Amino acid sequence: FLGFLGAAGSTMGAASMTLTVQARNLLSGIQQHLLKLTVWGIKQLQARVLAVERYLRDQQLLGIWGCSGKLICCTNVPWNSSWSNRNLSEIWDNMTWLQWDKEISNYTQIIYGLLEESQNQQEKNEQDLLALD
Amino acid sequence: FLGFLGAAGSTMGAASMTLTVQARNLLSGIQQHLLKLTVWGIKQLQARVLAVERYLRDQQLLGIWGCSGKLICCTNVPWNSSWSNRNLSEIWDNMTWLQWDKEISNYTQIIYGLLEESQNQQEKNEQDLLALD
Amino acid sequence: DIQMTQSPSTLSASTGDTVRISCRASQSITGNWVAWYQQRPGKAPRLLIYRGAALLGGVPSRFRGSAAGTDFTLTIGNLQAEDFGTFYCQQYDTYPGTFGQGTKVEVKRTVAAPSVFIFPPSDEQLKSGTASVVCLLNNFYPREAKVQWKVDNALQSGNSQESVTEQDSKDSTYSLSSTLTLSKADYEKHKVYACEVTHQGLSSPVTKSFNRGE
Amino acid sequence: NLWVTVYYGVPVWKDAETTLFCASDAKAYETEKHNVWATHACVPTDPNPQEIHLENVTEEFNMWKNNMVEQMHTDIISLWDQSLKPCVKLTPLCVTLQCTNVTNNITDDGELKNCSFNMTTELRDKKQKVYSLFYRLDVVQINSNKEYRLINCNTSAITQACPKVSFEPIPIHYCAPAGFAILKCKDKKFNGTGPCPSVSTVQCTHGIKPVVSTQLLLNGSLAEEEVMIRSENITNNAKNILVQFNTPVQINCTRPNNNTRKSIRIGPGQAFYATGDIIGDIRQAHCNVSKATWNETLGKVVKQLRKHFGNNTIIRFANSSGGDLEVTTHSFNCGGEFFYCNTSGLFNSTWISNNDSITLPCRIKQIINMWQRIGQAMYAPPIQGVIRCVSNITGLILTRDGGSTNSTTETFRPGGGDMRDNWRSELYKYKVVKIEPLGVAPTRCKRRV
Amino acid sequence: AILKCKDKKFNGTGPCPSVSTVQCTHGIKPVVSTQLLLNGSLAEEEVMIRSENITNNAKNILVQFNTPVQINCTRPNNNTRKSIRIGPGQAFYATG
Amino acid sequence: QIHLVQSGTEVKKPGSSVTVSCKAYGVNTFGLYAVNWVRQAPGQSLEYIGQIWRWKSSASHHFRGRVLISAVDLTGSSPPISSLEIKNLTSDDTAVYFCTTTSTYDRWSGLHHDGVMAFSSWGQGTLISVSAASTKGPSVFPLAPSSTAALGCLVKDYFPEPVTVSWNSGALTSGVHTFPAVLQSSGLYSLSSVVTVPSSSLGTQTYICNVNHKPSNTKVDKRVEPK
Ligand SMILES: *[C@@H]1O[C@H](CO)[C@@H](O[C@@H]2O[C@H](CO)[C@@H](O[C@@H]3O[C@H](CO[C@H]4O[C@H](CO[C@H]5O[C@H](CO)[C@@H](O)[C@H](O)[C@@H]5O)[C@@H](O)[C@H](O)[C@@H]4O)[C@@H](O)[C@H](O[C@H]4O[C@H](CO)[C@@H](O)[C@H](O)[C@@H]4O[C@H]4O[C@H](CO)[C@@H](O)[C@H](O)[C@@H]4O)[C@@H]3O)[C@H](O)[C@H]2NC(C)=O)[C@H](O)[C@H]1NC(C)=O
Ligand SMILES: *[C@@H]1O[C@H](CO)[C@@H](O[C@@H]2O[C@H](CO)[C@@H](O[C@@H]3O[C@H](CO[C@H]4O[C@H](CO)[C@@H](O)[C@H](O)[C@@H]4O)[C@@H](O)[C@H](O[C@H]4O[C@H](CO)[C@@H](O)[C@H](O)[C@@H]4O)[C@@H]3O)[C@H](O)[C@H]2NC(C)=O)[C@H](O)[C@H]1NC(C)=O
Ligand SMILES: *[C@@H]1O[C@H](CO)[C@@H](O[C@@H]2O[C@H](CO)[C@@H](O[C@@H]3O[C@H](CO[C@H]4O[C@H](CO)[C@@H](O)[C@H](O[C@H]5O[C@H](CO)[C@@H](O)[C@H](O)[C@@H]5O)[C@@H]4O)[C@@H](O)[C@H](O)[C@@H]3O)[C@H](O)[C@H]2NC(C)=O)[C@H](O)[C@H]1NC(C)=O
Ligand SMILES: *[C@@H]1O[C@H](CO)[C@@H](O[C@@H]2O[C@H](CO)[C@@H](O[C@@H]3O[C@H](CO)[C@@H](O)[C@H](O[C@H]4O[C@H](CO)[C@@H](O)[C@H](O)[C@@H]4O)[C@@H]3O)[C@H](O)[C@H]2NC(C)=O)[C@H](O)[C@H]1NC(C)=O
Ligand SMILES: *[C@@H]1O[C@H](CO)[C@@H](O[C@@H]2O[C@H](CO)[C@@H](O[C@@H]3O[C@H](CO[C@H]4O[C@H](CO)[C@@H](O)[C@H](O)[C@@H]4O)[C@@H](O)[C@H](O)[C@@H]3O)[C@H](O)[C@H]2NC(C)=O)[C@H](O)[C@H]1NC(C)=O
Ligand SMILES: *[C@@H]1O[C@H](CO)[C@@H](O[C@@H]2O[C@H](CO)[C@@H](O[C@@H]3O[C@H](CO[C@H]4O[C@H](CO)[C@@H](O)[C@H](O)[C@@H]4O)[C@@H](O)[C@H](O)[C@@H]3O)[C@H](O)[C@H]2NC(C)=O)[C@H](O)[C@H]1NC(C)=O
Ligand SMILES: *[C@@H]1O[C@H](CO)[C@@H](O[C@@H]2O[C@H](CO)[C@@H](O[C@@H]3O[C@H](CO)[C@@H](O)[C@H](O)[C@@H]3O)[C@H](O)[C@H]2NC(C)=O)[C@H](O)[C@H]1NC(C)=O
Ligand SMILES: *[C@@H]1O[C@H](CO)[C@@H](O[C@@H]2O[C@H](CO)[C@@H](O)[C@H](O)[C@H]2NC(C)=O)[C@H](O)[C@H]1NC(C)=O
Ligand SMILES: *[C@@H]1O[C@H](CO)[C@@H](O[C@@H]2O[C@H](CO)[C@@H](O)[C@H](O)[C@H]2NC(C)=O)[C@H](O)[C@H]1NC(C)=O
Ligand SMILES: *[C@@H]1O[C@H](CO)[C@@H](O[C@@H]2O[C@H](CO)[C@@H](O)[C@H](O)[C@H]2NC(C)=O)[C@H](O)[C@H]1NC(C)=O
Ligand SMILES: *[C@@H]1O[C@H](CO)[C@@H](O[C@@H]2O[C@H](CO)[C@@H](O)[C@H](O)[C@H]2NC(C)=O)[C@H](O)[C@H]1NC(C)=O
Ligand SMILES: *[C@@H]1O[C@H](CO)[C@@H](O[C@@H]2O[C@H](CO)[C@@H](O)[C@H](O)[C@H]2NC(C)=O)[C@H](O)[C@H]1NC(C)=O
Ligand SMILES: *[C@@H]1O[C@H](CO)[C@@H](O[C@@H]2O[C@H](CO)[C@@H](O)[C@H](O)[C@H]2NC(C)=O)[C@H](O)[C@H]1NC(C)=O
Ligand SMILES: *[C@@H]1O[C@H](CO)[C@@H](O)[C@H](O)[C@H]1NC(C)=O
Ligand SMILES: *[C@@H]1O[C@H](CO)[C@@H](O)[C@H](O)[C@H]1NC(C)=O
Ligand SMILES: *[C@@H]1O[C@H](CO)[C@@H](O)[C@H](O)[C@H]1NC(C)=O
Ligand SMILES: *[C@@H]1O[C@H](CO)[C@@H](O)[C@H](O)[C@H]1NC(C)=O
Ligand SMILES: *[C@@H]1O[C@H](CO)[C@@H](O)[C@H](O)[C@H]1NC(C)=O
């Protein structure tokens, strides 16, 4: 297997044919008569709350989107070539995360804005109007 | 923009072309060495638990339905004209929430019952039988 | 290699002004891998801005940069005395990192006519076997000025050299030295030596001269 | 042509900070001892330390930037506080004392003061004169026969440990909250800084003991092929030097005095277990290290010195210069008693170009206010019997003195007192990351209508 | 959500057209003062007359200030700080 | 704090080699900082020579194989140091050479882009002069006034740079313009230093310039009597 993060030193083609094993990792963790004054489980269950709330902000994204699961999803959102100018060989053959992550931070801003705009505009509205027959 | 609840003094047409900005509002909120006896975060994180559990009863609805997101959704559930007798001009032009909410409390009861009945009857069963080929 | 073409080469401004220096690349730099540097004469450059909009810790807020496609612009509002100097844009998108030609930022001053002086060669210099003629231009603005040497009323080129001070902090004027060098035997043969100066501050070319002997 | 596509679960990670959690073995809870010292409400250890080696990962590291050295430091001393709260307090004990020098043997001749004193008892209306034998380190005199109270009786309150708990450092795996990960530098030689190709990810750590020792390492992890030279700034002289052992060093620290305990009633519900009779003779605590293994240790260490600091110089050893008793001694528990060993003979050597155990005197002290959190001193109730604890030495903590010459000689001296070098020496090569699963790739694929 | 009545004159009761929503409030001080207000919020154009039941006499009257009022409350006595030992760990800082 | 101190100025003849040192004080290690060597030709733009990052030496194609850039980590005796060695000097190599330190611990810094980076720390500078000429004291000649007027000194045929010029042992500082050096066809340096003073004070006060050249250890005092 690849196990956990086994697609690390790879390219997003060979990584993209994987990573549901990596995706199924939010919870893997899961004596009350001695003196009953504990401190550990407060912060431990607190961390369980923080991890679940993190995953539900993630499901807030994976909910309100055009990408309700859809473990990976294609779009109808276009691409300006002024944004990047590489080839599918140049990325899918060898370019995987780093400055790719910096660019998709720029279009985390811009393109997540385009997820909101593409979602609002006519992914639902024209769906209603064509649905209303 | 309209911001938060900017479609308040509107009609459900112009409101209905909005409100994903209103919909993305469940979490917007997000010093341990002084004496380490706190009381605030117990009730604060308690309120985070109550708000998340509220939203997951909401996703219990938005899950088990014919309206898995589908941010807004049309149906196959009919309408008795004995229930209400207005026009799409009379509602979509000027009638937005109040006694509309009282009527859809009556058909919160009746019509949420029809969501359960319409969901059970042949939205899945006939889908299985036509699916079984 | 990336070719960084900087612009303008020289600009004049005053304190409190808002000034903009542009820098174009041969290719388009998407990642915004461009830095800006300030270098006062003699001392080492300072890194002011990296990656376009990023200010380095300690650089004043009035320095801000903008990056779109191939063009890049460094903007200095509320120009301060400490800000005057030379500025360089540097790309680091492709190996190797390349800098621009640079942009000089001079002080504004009212245009100033140059004080012209001519100096014949020292008699002691003649006993060494060489003769040097110097024409002095002092306290003038702006820095664009041309000197030619006229010996026996004939043009002379290829043997004159020039040296220029940096702008005076107090008056915002410049000063220039034109040194004309030639052999000892030729000097005695030439009849007369003249310096004609063409500058904006002078209504017509000012010529100051001397004949051998005084 | 082009559109975009959205991907989930992509290998994108940055660093972050959080609180980890423990993983104790369930075998130690069979010896629960009414909260066996560390483990009270811990997580059972996952028996599968899932370690996935990660190819093509070269991350710059530092063991001096980000850890729960401070956080778990405060967690361990907070456990110390939570132990000190419900157990026996010693508040009416600040009573003047009538003490005499002991007379059994000469190995302590002194230091054992037969201290009689007035006291009350259960019946608030009642009194109780008593005598007990105390080591010189728990008391101090005050200025007929000399009187002696207690050094904390003008500074801080005193509690003794409730005798049900243990004092054992427990092998506890430290696991990460999910959505995060722990990484590992699996090389042979790693001074704590720089990159690392040998990258593996583990959900947890290995089983890690809360060891309390100054100037050395006991029962810690062992180094690879060479003893390492780990520090932060060897150009600085204020930094300590961590030398993890290739080969562990045997030591036999003994309390060779069989003793007795006197439980005296200060109650109701209160009581104090004082020192009974020393059954037998009078000896001192001491430890034994074989001289040849010590010589090979010093030789291998000084070879690493001429690998790391210079190549050709003089390396001469002096002891600790002075200061606190915990600073001057390798200071550490032996089961329930805290040996403060005179490590003066172990720092007497000189290195320029090229069957016996070594026995050093050790001292025991009970009234302790460790980590200098002044306001609460801890008292150790006495233990009967000859105590023999077999520990094995697992590293070094040393100081670089001021040079002040032209590389003539180098005098290196003991140090410590922070315990954060024990934290970092037992907690390097591990790190905490946050995980980002979201990816967006533009291509020419398009959804339908 | 938290709502806000952004009018000028508002005695605390009645409707309000000037409605804004805020996620939070402004920065609010736990002020301990009787009979007045110190460092509180300031009113609009007029000082308001705020109460619940002015027909009742048991109700108090809240008058928020258009204009704040300067005051110079001084403890004009330089004093000494003593510390006597009641311990261990206890002690009492008495008046010097 | 981190600065960076480089070796002293060196004069070298064509075809020779040279190694410039750079002590990095304040730098914790070259595992968390990268070293870039850049030269600036006289009155010119800057040019990348090479770097050393992750203990990997490298050089630009123009300087590729002609230069060797080594560095050594921190020691208890001395801070970490990098060295720039340049073989087979030519006159086109006469330039100032700079040390560069940029933190490399964070991947997202935006200071560095996969080894190609901007330059966060800089050094004083090392003047590397390459010329076939040898050291030579300056011949100083007077620029005499004649006919407010101006006078000066002519410092000629000195190598290498620099020369310092002062007037009346520092007494006269106002109106003093010492022009930068020009390099002659003879591969020698030469400049002039002039003064503007009221002509009315030409016969009253005496004017002397003080030239000092430490490379040749030469110091001349020339009287500028008017003609
Ligand atoms: C670095 O690591 C090394 C390796 O871990 C450390 O070396 C350890 O050092 C410990 C002290 O520092 C020492 O701890 C003592 O262990 C004793 C043995 O306990 C075990 O066995 C007993 C009973 O078995 C005995 O008899 C059988 C049969 O003959 C033999 O086979 C055994 O070997 C034993 O001789 C079990 O009950 C235990 O559960 C263990 O399995 C303990 O006896 C001792 O605890 C005693 O004192 C405690 C404090 O008073 C008390 O709470 C506890 O109940 C014990 O009391 C004994 O005596 C009283 C007398 O009144 C009696 O009432 C009790 O019934 C009981 O007999 C310590 O726990 C470790 O043994 C030693 N080795 C190992 C492998 O861990 C080293 O210290 C460490 N370095 C540092 C700095 O820590
Ligand atoms: C593509 O995307 C990357 C990241 O998405 C963008 O790079 C960002 O560029 C912006 C430009 O403004 C950077 O913003 C500035 O960052 C400076 C560095 O921040 C560090 O230090 C500060 C101060 O200690 C810390 O607070 C911070 O956490 C960092 O450690 C800041 O110093 C700047 O803040 C200063 O000015 C602001 C002005 O509003 C003041 O309010 C502040 O008080 C302060 O004085 C400023 O935040 C940003 O950091 C860059 N991010 C990264 C990761 O590099 C690219 O620009 C973007 N390109 C395009 C085309 O989209
Ligand atoms: C009793 O004291 C209070 C407190 O001063 C007086 O109430 C008024 O308070 C408001 C703010 O609550 C002040 O009005 C405006 O304040 C704006 C906020 O400015 C603060 O924060 C700015 C950003 O950090 C900062 O620049 C600014 O500094 C300004 O005031 C400083 C002194 O407080 C001064 O040192 C600075 O130079 C600068 O002037 C503030 O910290 C601000 O942006 C507006 O310009 C404006 O100041 C009022 O000035 C206060 N006064 C009045 C008369 O309204 C209250 O009135 C006092 N009552 C009496 C009777 O004295
Ligand atoms: C902490 O540990 C790291 C890893 O052990 C260690 O970094 C190592 O430093 C040495 C030297 O500082 C590096 O060795 C280099 O190897 C290359 C490849 O052959 C050589 O070209 C280098 O030679 C240069 O430096 C020599 C030093 O005398 C010069 O003589 C020579 O002219 C060149 O300048 C050099 O030998 C080694 O690669 C690194 N390893 C890593 C992973 O970086 C670091 O020094 C340790 N720090 C402390 C304080 O212990
Ligand atoms: C690790 O410990 C090292 C010391 O053991 C620390 O090195 C010191 O770092 C500081 C700044 O962090 C430097 O201070 C600067 O020094 C430079 C260079 O000037 C030096 O040399 C001149 C000429 O002889 C001398 O006059 C100065 O006093 C300096 O000795 C100055 O330009 C700066 O203004 C500033 O003073 C120390 O010089 C430097 N000392 C040594 C011996 O390296 C190092 O910082 C520590 N690392 C960390 C992370 O703390
Ligand atoms: C750590 O090292 C310490 C120093 O080596 C050890 O101390 C030793 O402890 C033992 C007991 O454990 C003592 O042995 C005693 O020796 C005296 C004298 O015996 C000698 O003379 C008699 C009579 O002629 C003869 O029979 C013996 O063989 C000896 O020649 C005896 O009277 C006692 O009964 C007892 O045997 C050692 O004296 C003492 N010192 C030394 C230098 O050996 C300590 O035990 C070590 N601890 C561990 C855990 O290793
Ligand atoms: C001090 O004690 C520790 C713990 O005993 C020694 O560390 C090493 O521990 C491992 C794991 O327990 C031992 O490996 C195996 O131990 C089992 C059971 O003891 C045994 O059946 C196997 O044959 C194997 O020995 C290992 O022996 C032990 N020693 C070494 C050298 O790796 C530590 O070494 C001790 N130090 C000294 C100086 O005695
Ligand atoms: C780690 O990266 C290296 C490349 O840097 C990968 O090595 C390649 O492996 C494939 C398959 O074996 C070969 O076809 C290539 O020729 C190799 N290239 C090089 C430069 O070695 C390596 O596979 C990566 N590791 C993993 C687990 O994917
Ligand atoms: C608030 O409600 C008023 C009506 O009560 C809206 O006013 C209407 O605005 C539209 C667009 O400007 C006009 O065509 C109508 O003629 C207006 N009607 C009246 C009666 O004034 C107003 O737009 C609402 N505001 C918001 C934000 O919804
Ligand atoms: C520390 O003490 C242990 C015993 O407590 C010693 O171990 C013995 O060593 C001898 C050889 O010297 C062996 O024959 C025995 O079998 C060992 N016994 C046990 C129980 O381990 C050890 O040598 C002592 N080490 C030092 C440095 O004193
Ligand atoms: C370090 O070792 C020396 C030698 O053992 C210690 O004791 C000194 O011994 C000489 C012997 O005459 C005395 O003159 C000194 O006064 C002693 N020093 C002190 C401070 O008393 C020294 O104590 C040792 N240091 C430690 C911490 O043990
Ligand atoms: C190291 O310790 C030895 C003793 O363990 C010291 O050597 C003694 O030195 C004194 C004079 O200083 C002599 O009178 C003794 O005869 C020596 N004894 C032995 C056994 O050699 C030595 O001085 C110590 N060295 C240091 C630096 O402390
Ligand atoms: C301390 O020594 C005493 C005596 O040497 C040991 O206690 C004796 O134990 C035996 C049984 O083993 C009893 O029969 C005796 O009555 C005891 N005598 C005394 C005086 O107590 C004792 O075991 C040693 N202490 C410990 C804790 O082991
Ligand atoms: C990409 O195209 C859109 C539409 O023309 C435009 O608004 C945007 O500015 C372009 N991107 C950039 C970086 O200019
Ligand atoms: C609407 O029609 C259904 C079927 O006739 C009937 O059961 C229901 O009661 C009607 N609604 C009302 C309000 O009567
Ligand atoms: C023991 O006590 C006596 C009486 O005070 C004293 O004279 C003697 O010095 C003491 N011995 C020691 C070692 O303190
Ligand atoms: C260590 O042993 C060697 C012989 O193997 C000896 O030469 C050396 O002096 C010894 N060192 C010490 C400090 O005893
Ligand atoms: C030290 O010198 C010795 C003998 O020349 C040599 O074997 C060794 O490799 C050198 N070590 C270093 C670090 O230079």
Author numbering:
A (entry chain B), B (entry chain C): 519 to 548, 562 to 664
C (entry chain L): 1 to 30, 30A, 31 to 213
D (entry chain D): 33 to 141, 152 to 185, 187 to 309, 312 to 321, 321A, 322 to 398, 411 to 505
E (entry chain E): 224 to 309, 312 to 321
F (entry chain K): 1 to 35, 35A, 36 to 52, 54 to 77, 77A, 77B, 77C, 77D, ...
Quote the study that presented this structure, word for word.
BG1 differs from other V1V2 antibodies in that two BG1 Fabs bind per Env trimer to create a previously-unseen form of asymmetric recognition of the V1V2 loops at the Env trimer apex. In order to explore the details of how two BG1 Fabs bind asymmetrically to the three V1V2 loops in an Env trimer, we used single-particle cryo-EM to solve the structure of a BG1-Env complex. A single-particle reconstruction of a BG1-Env-8ANC195 complex with two BG1 Fabs per Env trimer was obtained at a resolution of ~6.2 Å (calculated using the 0.143 gold-standard Fourier shell coefficient cutoff criterion). The 6.2 Å BG1-Env-8ANC195 structure with two BG1 Fabs (2:1 BG1-Env) showed interactions with two of the three gp120 protomers within Env trimer. Within the limits of the resolution of the cryo-EM structure, the CDRH3 and CDRH2 loops of BG1_A and BG1_B adopted the same conformation as their counterparts in the unbound BG1 crystal structure. Although BG1 is directed against the same general region of Env, its epitope shows glycan interactions dominating over protein interactions, and the relatively long BG1 CDRH3 is folded into a compact structure that is used to make contacts with Env glycans rather than Env protein residues. The role of reaching through the glycan shield to contact protein residues is taken by BG1’s unusually long CDRH2, resulting in a different epitope footprint on Env than seen for typical V1V2 bNAbs such as PG9. Contacts with Env glycans were also made differently for BG1 and PG9: The Asn156gp120 glycan on both gp120_A and gp120_B was contacted by the BG1 CDRL1, and the Asn160gp120 glycan was contacted on both gp120s by the CDRH2 and CDRH3 loops of BG1 and also by the CDRL3 in the case of BG1_B. The BG1_B Fab interacts not only with glycans on its primary subunit contact gp120_B; the complex structure also suggests a potential secondary interaction with the Asn160gp120 glycan on a neighboring subunit, gp120_A, using CDRL1.
The HIV-1 envelope (Env) glycoprotein trimer, a trimer of gp120-gp41 heterodimers, is the infectious machinery that targets host cell receptors CD4 and CCR5/CXCR4 to mediate fusion between the viral and host membranes. As the only viral protein on the surface of HIV-1 virions, Env trimer is the sole target of neutralizing antibodies that prevent infection of host cells. The V1V2 epitope on HIV Env is targeted by bNAbs that make quaternary interactions that prevent opening of Env trimer to expose the V3 loop and coreceptor binding site, hence blocking conformational changes leading to fusion of the viral and host cell membranes. A new V1V2 bNAb, BG1, was isolated along with bNAbs targeting non-overlapping sites on Env from an HIV-1 controller who developed elite levels of HIV-1 neutralizing activity.
